[PDB]
A paper describes a structure:
RdRP comprises the subunits PA (polymerase acidic protein), PB1 and PB2 (polymerase basic protein 1 and 2). Subsequently, the PA subunit cleaves the RNA strain approximately 10–13 nucleotides downstream from the 5′-cap to acquire the cap/primer. The PA subunit is a bridged binuclear metalloenzyme with an N-terminal domain (PA-Nter) harboring the endonuclease active site that carries out cleavage of the RNA segment. The active site is a negatively charged pocket that accommodates either Mg2+ or Mn2+ ions, with stronger affinity for the latter.
One key mutation in the influenza A/H1N1 2009 pandemic (A/H1N1pdm) and A/H3N2 viruses is Ile-38 to Thr-38 in PA-Nter. This mutation reduced patient susceptibility to baloxavir marboxil and impaired the virus’ replicative fitness in cells. Using X-ray crystallography, we solved structures of the wild-type PA-N-terminal domain and its I38T mutant in complex with orientin at 1.9 Å and 2.2 Å resolution, respectively. Compared to wild-type PA-Nter, the I38T variant had only 1.9% activity toward the ssRNA substrate and none for ssDNA. Ligands in both structures form a hydrogen bond with Oε2Glu-26 at the C-7 position. However, there is a little ligand shift visible in the mutant variant. Moreover, there is a visible movement of the Tyr-24 side chain in the mutant variant, likely to be due to the ligand shift. Thr-38, which is one atom shorter than Ile-38, helps accommodate orientin. Oγ1Thr-38 forms a hydrogen bond through W21 to the glucosyl moiety of the ligand (O6). Crystallographic study of the orientin complex with I38T PA-Nter revealed an additional point of interaction of the flavonoid with Thr-38 mediated by a water molecule.
Author numbering: -2 to 53, 73 to 196
Amino acid sequence: SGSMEDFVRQCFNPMIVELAEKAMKEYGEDPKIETNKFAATCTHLEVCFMYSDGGSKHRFEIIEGRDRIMAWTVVNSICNTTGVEKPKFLPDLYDYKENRFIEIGVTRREVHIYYLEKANKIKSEKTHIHIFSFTGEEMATKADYTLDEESRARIKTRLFTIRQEMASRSLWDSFRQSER
Ligand SMILES: O=c1cc(-c2ccc(O)c(O)c2)oc2c([C@@H]3O[C@H](CO)[C@@H](O)[C@H](O)[C@H]3O)c(O)cc(O)c12
Ligand SMILES: [Mn+2]
Ligand SMILES: [Mn+2]
């Protein structure tokens, strides 16, 4: 869907776009062909970045977007230095304030369905899950949202703006239907 490709290149910062293209190609997927996955990958990356800018300076270490060696360097480092259980999958962030890894979910489906799939995927209590939708819904572990409402509101409003713009360009219906 090349009109979606055009949208991704117009919508997302070039750093996010280049990171998403590398990520997909590493799984043998072509951004030019799986354009809905390209937009999805960019959105999750951007949310991960916005979330890391949510609170105090350096509250959050970013793990998402990092090459595997550096990602695992951050994760193993943190687990040696805080004694928190070493996750089996790379999470998205580490919360220095709350001493927990965070998995970040962005879903075109219902938040509760995605929360469960993440929980069942993770199989490790300590890691905090936080889900966003394009429709303003969000849900987190023990209903603990980590950030203040003003920072969550920027993320929720950004995801809404993205859905809206996709909608004006008749890309949203495909994109919504395309998810796992
Ligand atoms: O870099 C990638 C990152 C992720 C990813 C997704 C959710 C997270 O929460 C998360 O931390 C990371 O997913 C990717 C996927 C897929 O994106 C679907 C979502 O649109 C997922 O449902 C699939 O399961 C995935 O394999 C690709 O196809 C290619 C990719 O480079 C990636
Ligand atoms: Mn991740
Ligand atoms: Mn994630």
